[PDB]
Scaffold this active site. Structure first.
Site, PDB file in Angstrom:
ATOM      1  N   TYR A 504     -24.244   1.355  13.838  1.00  0.00           N
ATOM      2  CA  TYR A 504     -23.123   1.373  12.901  1.00  0.00           C
ATOM      3  C   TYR A 504     -22.888  -0.088  12.496  1.00  0.00           C
ATOM      4  O   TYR A 504     -23.105  -0.457  11.342  1.00  0.00           O
ATOM      5  CB  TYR A 504     -21.896   2.078  13.512  1.00  0.00           C
ATOM      6  CG  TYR A 504     -20.550   1.846  12.859  1.00  0.00           C
ATOM      7  CD1 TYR A 504     -20.441   1.276  11.593  1.00  0.00           C
ATOM      8  CD2 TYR A 504     -19.375   2.236  13.504  1.00  0.00           C
ATOM      9  CE1 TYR A 504     -19.196   1.060  10.992  1.00  0.00           C
ATOM     10  CE2 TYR A 504     -18.109   2.031  12.907  1.00  0.00           C
ATOM     11  CZ  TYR A 504     -18.037   1.438  11.647  1.00  0.00           C
ATOM     12  OH  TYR A 504     -16.816   1.215  11.028  1.00  0.00           O
ATOM     13  N   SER A 587     -24.037   5.677   6.594  1.00  0.00           N
ATOM     14  CA  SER A 587     -23.023   4.834   5.943  1.00  0.00           C
ATOM     15  C   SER A 587     -23.405   3.384   6.140  1.00  0.00           C
ATOM     16  O   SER A 587     -24.491   2.962   5.717  1.00  0.00           O
ATOM     17  CB  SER A 587     -21.610   5.072   6.515  1.00  0.00           C
ATOM     18  OG  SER A 587     -21.360   6.436   6.880  1.00  0.00           O
ATOM     19  N   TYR A 588     -22.533   2.626   6.812  1.00  0.00           N
ATOM     20  CA  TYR A 588     -22.786   1.209   7.106  1.00  0.00           C
ATOM     21  C   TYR A 588     -24.019   1.058   8.006  1.00  0.00           C
ATOM     22  O   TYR A 588     -24.812   0.126   7.843  1.00  0.00           O
ATOM     23  CB  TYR A 588     -21.551   0.541   7.739  1.00  0.00           C
ATOM     24  CG  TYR A 588     -21.576  -0.977   7.666  1.00  0.00           C
ATOM     25  CD1 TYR A 588     -20.758  -1.672   6.763  1.00  0.00           C
ATOM     26  CD2 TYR A 588     -22.432  -1.717   8.478  1.00  0.00           C
ATOM     27  CE1 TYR A 588     -20.788  -3.068   6.678  1.00  0.00           C
ATOM     28  CE2 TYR A 588     -22.478  -3.103   8.400  1.00  0.00           C
ATOM     29  CZ  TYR A 588     -21.653  -3.776   7.501  1.00  0.00           C
ATOM     30  OH  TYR A 588     -21.716  -5.154   7.448  1.00  0.00           O
ATOM     31  N   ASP A 665     -22.011  12.872  -3.241  1.00  0.00           N
ATOM     32  CA  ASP A 665     -21.324  11.953  -2.370  1.00  0.00           C
ATOM     33  C   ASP A 665     -20.355  11.092  -3.200  1.00  0.00           C
ATOM     34  O   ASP A 665     -20.773  10.258  -4.026  1.00  0.00           O
ATOM     35  CB  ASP A 665     -22.364  11.084  -1.656  1.00  0.00           C
ATOM     36  CG  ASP A 665     -21.767  10.217  -0.571  1.00  0.00           C
ATOM     37  OD1 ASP A 665     -22.484   9.958   0.427  1.00  0.00           O
ATOM     38  OD2 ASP A 665     -20.598   9.792  -0.716  1.00  0.00           O
ATOM     39  N   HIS A 697     -20.660  12.824   1.472  1.00  0.00           N
ATOM     40  CA  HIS A 697     -21.001  11.822   2.469  1.00  0.00           C
ATOM     41  C   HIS A 697     -21.210  12.393   3.866  1.00  0.00           C
ATOM     42  O   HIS A 697     -21.908  11.800   4.694  1.00  0.00           O
ATOM     43  CB  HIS A 697     -19.969  10.702   2.502  1.00  0.00           C
ATOM     44  CG  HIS A 697     -20.437   9.501   3.252  1.00  0.00           C
ATOM     45  ND1 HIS A 697     -21.462   8.700   2.798  1.00  0.00           N
ATOM     46  CD2 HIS A 697     -20.052   8.985   4.439  1.00  0.00           C
ATOM     47  CE1 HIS A 697     -21.681   7.734   3.670  1.00  0.00           C
ATOM     48  NE2 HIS A 697     -20.839   7.883   4.675  1.00  0.00           N
TER      49      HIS A 697
HETATM   50  C1  RUF Z   1     -20.543   4.774  10.991  1.00  0.00           C
HETATM   51  N1  RUF Z   1     -19.159   4.556  10.532  1.00  0.00           N
HETATM   52  C2  RUF Z   1     -18.923   3.805   9.420  1.00  0.00           C
HETATM   53  O1  RUF Z   1     -19.844   3.303   8.791  1.00  0.00           O
HETATM   54  C3  RUF Z   1     -17.591   3.607   8.982  1.00  0.00           C
HETATM   55  C4  RUF Z   1     -16.538   4.183   9.696  1.00  0.00           C
HETATM   56  N2  RUF Z   1     -15.412   3.854   9.055  1.00  0.00           N
HETATM   57  C5  RUF Z   1     -15.658   3.114   7.980  1.00  0.00           C
HETATM   58  N3  RUF Z   1     -14.672   2.624   7.114  1.00  0.00           N
HETATM   59  C6  RUF Z   1     -13.290   3.056   7.443  1.00  0.00           C
HETATM   60  C7  RUF Z   1     -12.980   4.424   6.805  1.00  0.00           C
HETATM   61  N4  RUF Z   1     -13.272   4.435   5.355  1.00  0.00           N
HETATM   62  C8  RUF Z   1     -14.643   4.015   5.010  1.00  0.00           C
HETATM   63  C9  RUF Z   1     -14.962   2.663   5.654  1.00  0.00           C
HETATM   64  N5  RUF Z   1     -17.020   2.925   7.907  1.00  0.00           N
HETATM   65  C10 RUF Z   1     -17.804   2.227   6.881  1.00  0.00           C
HETATM   66  C11 RUF Z   1     -18.271   3.286   5.891  1.00  0.00           C
HETATM   67  C12 RUF Z   1     -17.943   4.638   6.041  1.00  0.00           C
HETATM   68  C13 RUF Z   1     -18.363   5.596   5.127  1.00  0.00           C
HETATM   69  C14 RUF Z   1     -19.137   5.208   4.042  1.00  0.00           C
HETATM   70  C15 RUF Z   1     -19.474   3.868   3.875  1.00  0.00           C
HETATM   71  C16 RUF Z   1     -19.038   2.923   4.797  1.00  0.00           C
HETATM   72 CL1  RUF Z   1     -19.468   1.268   4.591  1.00  0.00          CL
HETATM   73  N6  RUF Z   1     -16.830   4.935  10.838  1.00  0.00           N
HETATM   74  C17 RUF Z   1     -15.734   5.558  11.591  1.00  0.00           C
HETATM   75  C18 RUF Z   1     -18.129   5.107  11.218  1.00  0.00           C
HETATM   76  O2  RUF Z   1     -18.385   5.766  12.205  1.00  0.00           O
END
Ligand code: RUF
Ligand SMILES: *[C@@H]1O[C@H](CO)[C@@H](O[C@@H]2O[C@H](CO)[C@@H](O)[C@H](O)[C@H]2NC(C)=O)[C@H](O)[C@H]1NC(C)=O
Ligand SMILES: *[C@@H]1O[C@H](CO)[C@@H](O[C@@H]2O[C@H](CO)[C@@H](O)[C@H](O)[C@H]2NC(C)=O)[C@H](O)[C@H]1NC(C)=O
Ligand SMILES: *[C@@H]1O[C@H](CO)[C@@H](O[C@@H]2O[C@H](CO)[C@@H](O)[C@H](O)[C@H]2NC(C)=O)[C@H](O)[C@H]1NC(C)=O
Ligand code: RUF
Ligand code: NAG
Ligand code: NAG
Ligand code: NAG
Ligand code: NAG
Ligand code: NAG
Ligand code: NAG
Ligand code: NAG
Ligand code: NAG
EC number: 3.4.14.5
Lengths: 723, 729
Positions: A504, A587-588, A665, A697
């Site tokens: 992550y 995601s990240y 998404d 997503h």
């Molecule tokens: C793995 N992961 C995350 O990446 C994460 C994540 N939370 C985030 N952020 C806080 C909630 N809103 C989105 C950003 N991220 C980053 C992310 C999430 C969804 C799409 C793009 C991104 Cl850059 N979690 C819980 C989480 O578990």
């Protein structure tokens, strides 16, 4: 026998929960629905769901009014974003068992909520706010300005729902329900993300979905805040909504409303954040008598800032006020960068810190006249443990650990839930052993009883070869960085296992913890004999700012390098086959996976990115600018350009890559992967792909969920030469 | 040794290591033609050539020149630059005019940027161009242009240019302008797309584009509102810069105005006679109108006594549309290809006044096209030679004695040449012959008076010199009897082919209505690599529904797309194994477009014959594809027509059966033709029944997936997939 992909997919081995809604200071509900007395553990049936035998509609959720005179029934649920949705509603009278038929809550309601006392009701329809004093009487229209995709009264737009509030609602009742506080969002000039929605096979022409969505550096929504007195609503004249303007220090430019917290019956506090999210201001606003306005004195503004980073973990922390509301507590980072509880006087600049040390407060859970209850990772200096503490308000050195020694072997990760006045609390333990649910009495902290021990699950797991979890740390530049490993059953140190790095690595992430999980990793370790490891490097959370702010203005640098260094440290652990190292993330995690595979490091043979960010100008403004600042020549454009996965396409010649993305998404737009593939195509790199038609997503559909994991397992087995 | 050790590799195919030279010319007169080096004029008679246009002349120009067009009187040249592609034929470009006799660029009254179509009159140097959906005419290049239409509106009104469907399925061309033989009149079509729904898809563009664009094209899917059409003729000699130009409407016959119809053909017959062909939306009934200019009126009249009906009881009319007429000089008669009483397409001779025509050709073969007619002779391409439907030869029939037929190409070089096409001079005095195979392409020039060969233009001997050392595949062309009917197939066979061992086999599929994948053409393609390098037999089969063998075969899939043609491909494979040299554990199938649809339908059929397959940009369900093409074969997707079979023939409903096979699904995201939707819907169905499969999208690629880098990537990807399905290392 082993924990198999099917087991995980068809949820064969279930984790029992014990979810409760406190109703009073000694009672809670438990889905028939029971009411339990916390004292004795006795229960009577609240309603049989055969009460709505003839209802004719499929009931989604229930909601009891505070005074217990009415129940709200929710049906025709249509999911929108992560929190937002639409539904139909009905009000059932408990006093005289039957539904209401006159002046019902309209179809397609966006949000509903009881006031905190009695049975007042506020709801949102077509972006406008309505109020029912009594469930059977007509409602008063509060706002008249709501417009689809443009003006939002009482509910959030896309970016506020996802990044600011983690909620669709923007309504705040005062403690006794006299006042309804709300926010209004304006999206007039926010650009729209457009994407195809293919829908059912019978749809001849695809639909185009359009959503106001500010990407990094784009025009953001604007926000206004309002308070309305619900004890003086006239069925003759329009409700009057008093406005509270943001402080002068915020109206100077773009800004966010980031927190709403009532202090007393007539005192509210709002938190505002600059678009450059390193300066925030707390307003305390008091209601003026005959004059009927809200004043927010300048001498009552509390500034929170950061020289090394952004403010808060994801947002400035929330205040917990004393009863008289003349004082509050909130978590802020101290002088050495660690997050601890500070105590403020409404009238004074300086706060005194009431906790100290090289560890962090996670959150304030309950506040009494005598004690403050909090959760932290102090126990045994373990950043990934979580325990409940009690701190004595007249003597800060008197700190008791309430959950530490309850079962130190099986329990190191606790969350809590207190009753209305913190008379009783429920502890929830999430690992390392099976989840444990216990009921406690705060007058002395003795344990009343076990609510759920998961012995059903424990007897089933006795039969299967289960993996284990190692949680430990490595030293890097004289600093501890934590990792965890899911290890195959009968793990042999003198053998060479293929390793998969689960990533992550986003700012304030934590992937190494004491939590017990039954997931894809469980199967990969149990059935495929693969070690699944995770690592929290620079940028990771709950370990101080020095580590967390390490990536300020520099996304895609240190946290990427640290995943590579992690996999190197594991190679030198002896039991890792370094011809078979893989990395994956969502995601990240997908972005980091991609950046790592594009690094040309030589460490990883293959990897999987799911719904990855590919470049930061593609992602939303609030999250992105929090860490990257603005994509402009005078701020940080250079690094936005230097941190794309596209720029690393040539290095992909060295690895096997699988890229996966849902076509609907709304969060990480399909665009992001569209641009990655084009880039790999343009440099002649062969790779694997997969789109999921109309998945968002989450790729969360029953069938799509199974498809993706199945697909990924095949990729990994092939990459690792597993039959 | 000196034994052959090279093979035709993937890189060879992708990098064009072995290139076919081709002699492309454009006749400018009766005995002269143009050819590129530099630009030369060649005297067809002698061979003497002088430089017509030196390469250096347009470097002062400042812009990169995409194409040129010399005026009919050789006095002016049109220079095309800033080409920006749209669909298969349509594009936008800038134009400048270079005066040859004054030897410099015309500066005054230029043709505007973003011009959609430009065309010289057939004689002299008049000019017609379309800009912003309107028609403009320039009598002289340096003079102001008169505006002909005022109603042009983007995506709504199209004057002189086609819309999406007419471009792709009716005219195979962007333009809808027709100069009368001497440039007096300019005939044009107007398309109205008001009520035509739009297909919307994302274009992602360069990575610097922050928000994807949404592309919106008027695109009628089966059963949707079709574009309407009007027809006009304007006299370009009576244009004045004082009054707006007058366009005479020619309305369709009564029998077409009765419902939805199409304008399917426009052919001038003389200076003052134009012929129209119209088609009903149910494409089994067409009407040819022959219209004459009236001197005193200035208006056109199509006598009902000159009207010609063409229809079909067993299917649609024509191969893809009714055939075009070829008029005699006096425009009193015409020759036109139609099917004889027994389903064979042959040349019919028509008098303008009479209903009945007489067939001038007969046989259990078909005429492909009429290539030229003069006073004494008609020239046509057919597949008569040796009863090979996949062969092509040039023939000559004497207009005054039908039993006097000469083959002009049959015997020229029988061993290497069996597939011909021709290019005649301005009055058919000379012709270039192009031979596509079975040997290396050959290009020759001839005078038609005596029919003697004048010279070899291009013999591909440089290519021959290179292939001499390479282990090349061979092609076997043959047939099998089924239900007492001959059905042709072709095999690309690996080098040193051995009948006694078992090879893996790939079925290369098109199988659409009037398709032909079994022929004598020579190809350097993906299949050549697979045979040569990888030792895979790649085969093709023309089953029921295929063309150039008569209507009995071609119409067999009428109103039943996804049935016999699908079934005949499965039977083809069973036949191929039954020849003994096929490993039936390793049989695959692949196709593009219609071929992708058939591939999918085959893999979902539950046959047990195929181990894997690749569908590229496939049709998944017919209600998703365009009206003109789909309705031609399926009729209307309504309960009182053929909805039942529309619903019965999707690939989606066969998803469960994909559990038995390996499947690779490929689609470009910006495919305006077969929309991404169709693949999107297949993938979703497979996910819903829990079938694993391989997928690949191509960002911003269209139906051709034809970018240099994109083309290389998909063939590489497909190659890996097949090599793994067949256990090739
Ligand atoms: C793995 N992961 C995350 O990446 C994460 C994540 N939370 C985030 N952020 C806080 C909630 N809103 C989105 C950003 N991220 C980053 C992310 C999430 C969804 C799409 C793009 C991104 Cl850059 N979690 C819980 C989480 O578990
Ligand atoms: C939401 O914000 C928009 C954009 O700032 C406002 O639109 C402006 O309204 C003013 C006064 O009505 C006009 O003079 C401007 O021309 C408008 N600008 C644009 C671009 O539309 C709008 O008033 C706001 N709406 C609400 C309810 O607050
Ligand atoms: C309460 O406020 C709303 C909006 O200000 C009023 O509804 C509008 O009435 C005005 C005239 O006063 C009309 O021009 C608008 O078309 C109405 N908009 C609607 C239907 O939302 C409403 O009448 C007000 N009540 C009164 C009488 O004060
Ligand atoms: C193209 O066709 C459209 C619709 O098919 C025509 O629109 C009609 O125009 C008249 C007035 O000009 C209206 O009264 C009709 O109601 C319209 N038809 C409908 C049902 O939309 C239009 O005239 C055509 N455009 C041109 C200029 O040829
Ligand atoms: C392989 N193949 C065809 O499939 C083909 C094809 N031609 C057609 N049709 C006639 C020309 N215009 C398009 C339709 N098809 C079917 C088709 C082509 C492109 C997209 C969709 C379809 Cl259904 N060819 C030449 C051809 O070679
Ligand atoms: C539990 O027991 C007490 C006394 O025995 C009773 O007053 C109470 O109503 C009971 N609670 C429930 C919900 O059954
Ligand atoms: C909601 O919709 C249903 C079905 O369309 C309708 O019958 C019902 O009365 C609606 N409910 C209300 C209270 O508007
Ligand atoms: C709640 O607080 C308000 C505001 O202080 C006060 O006037 C009232 O007593 C309470 N509201 C009601 C009517 O319960
Ligand atoms: C906030 O960040 C900006 C941009 O990095 C910087 O100029 C400014 O000093 C920061 N503000 C504070 C309070 O440190
Ligand atoms: C081509 O050659 C012929 C034959 O000698 C000659 O008369 C002629 O001048 C040449 N072409 C022209 C017209 O310039
Ligand atoms: C076309 O565009 C170019 C570049 O902007 C301009 O210089 C030129 O004048 C234009 N040509 C015409 C014919 O308008
Ligand atoms: C030609 O037609 C257009 C559009 O109908 C009109 O505006 C223009 O004035 C006409 N020209 C003349 C002067 O006849
Ligand atoms: C072209 O044809 C028209 C109609 O036959 C005729 O009147 C005109 O003069 C012709 N042009 C020439 C000069 O050949």
């Amino acid at each position: 026998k082993t924990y198999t992909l099917t087991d995980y997919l068809k949820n064969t081995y279930r984790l029992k929960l014990y979810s409760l809604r406190w109703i009073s200071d000694h009672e809670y509900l438990y889905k028939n629905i029971l009411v339990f007395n916390a004292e004795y553990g006795n229960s009577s049936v609240f309603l049989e769901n055969s009460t709505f035998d003839e209802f004719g509609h499929s009931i989604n959720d229930y909601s009891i009014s505070p005074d217990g005179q009415f129940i709200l029934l929710e049906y025709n649920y249509v999911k929108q974003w992560r929190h937002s949705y639409t539904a139909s509603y009905d009000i059932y009278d408990l006093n005289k068992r039957q539904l209401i038929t006159e002046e019902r809550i309209p179809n397609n309601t966006q949000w509903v909520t009881w006031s905190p006392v009695g049975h007042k009701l506020a709801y949102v329809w077509n972006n406008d706010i309505y109020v029912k004093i009594e469930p059977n009487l007509p409602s008063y229209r509060i706002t008249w300005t709501g417009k689809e995709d443009i003006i939002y009264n009482g509910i959030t737009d896309w970016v506020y729902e996802e990044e600011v509030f983690s909620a669709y609602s923007a309504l705040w009742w005062s403690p006794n329900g006299t006042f309804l506080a709300y926010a209004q969002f304006n999206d007039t000039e926010v650009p729209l993300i457009e994407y195809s929605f293919y829908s059912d096979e019978s749809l001849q022409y695809p639909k185009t979905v359009r959503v106001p969505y500010p990407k990094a550096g784009a025009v953001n929504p604007t926000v206004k805040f309002f308070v309305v007195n619900t004890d003086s609503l006239s069925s003759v004249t329009n409700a009057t909504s008093i406005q509270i303007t943001a402080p002068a220090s915020m109206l100077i430019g773009d800004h966010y409303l980031c927190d709403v917290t009532w202090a007393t019956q007539e005192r509210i506090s709002l938190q505002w954040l600059r678009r450059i999210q390193n300066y925030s201001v707390m307003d305390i606003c008091d209601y003026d008598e005959s004059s009927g306005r809200w004043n927010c004195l300048v001498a009552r503004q509390h500034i929170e800032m950061s020289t090394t980073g952004w403010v808060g973990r994801f947002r400035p922390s929330e205040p917990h006020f004393t009863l008289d509301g003349n004082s509050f507590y909130k978590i802020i980072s101290n002088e050495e960068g660690y997050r601890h509880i500070c105590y403020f006087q409404i009238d004074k600049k300086d706060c005194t810190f009431i906790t100290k040390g090289t560890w962090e407060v996670i959150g304030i859970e309950a506040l009494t006249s005598d004690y403050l209850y909090y959760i932290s990772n102090e126990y045994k200096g373990m950043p990934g443990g979580r325990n409940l503490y009690k701190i004595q308000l007249s003597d800060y050195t008197k700190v008791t650990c309430l959950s530490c020694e309850l079962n130190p072997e099986r329990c190191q990760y606790y969350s809590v839930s207190f009753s209305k006045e913190a008379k009783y609390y429920q502890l929830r333990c999430s690992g390392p052993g099976l989840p444990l649910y216990t009921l406690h009495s705060s007058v002395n902290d003795k344990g009343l009883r076990v609510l759920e021990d998961n012995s059903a699950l424990d007897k089933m797991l006795q039969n299967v070869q289960m993996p284990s979890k190692k949680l430990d740390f490595i030293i890097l530049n004289e600093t501890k960085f934590w990792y965890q490993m899911i290890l195959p059953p009968h793990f042999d140190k003198s053998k060479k296992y293929p390793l998969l790095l689960d990533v992550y690595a986003g700012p304030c992430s934590q992937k190494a913890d004491t939590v017990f999980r039954l997931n894809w990793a469980t199967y990969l370790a149990s059935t495929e004999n693969i070690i699944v490891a995770s690592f929290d490097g620079r940028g990771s959370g709950y370990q101080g700012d020095k580590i967390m702010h390490a990536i300020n203005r520099r996304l895609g640098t240190f946290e990427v390098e640290d995943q590579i260094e992690a996999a190197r440290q594991f190679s030198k652990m002896g039991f890792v086959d370094n011809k078979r190292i893989a990395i994956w993330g969502w995601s990240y995690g997908g972005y980091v996976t991609s950046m790592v595979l594009g690094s040309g490091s030589g460490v990883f043979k293959c990897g999987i990115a799911v719904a990855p960010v590919s470049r930061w100008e593609y992602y939303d403004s609030v999250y992105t600018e929090r860490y990257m600042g603005l994509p402009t020549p005078e701020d940080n454009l250079d690094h936005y350009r230097n941190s794309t996965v596209m720029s690393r396409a040539e290095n992909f010649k060295q690895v096997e890559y699988l890229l996966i993305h849902g076509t609907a998404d709304d969060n990480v737009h399909f665009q992001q992967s569209a641009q990655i593939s084009k880039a790999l195509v343009d440099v002649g790199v062969d790779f694997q792909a997969m789109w999921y038609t109309d998945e968002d997503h989450g790729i969360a559909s029953s069938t799509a969920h199974q498809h993706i994991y199945t697909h990924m397992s095949h990729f990994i087995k092939q990459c690792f030469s597993l039959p």
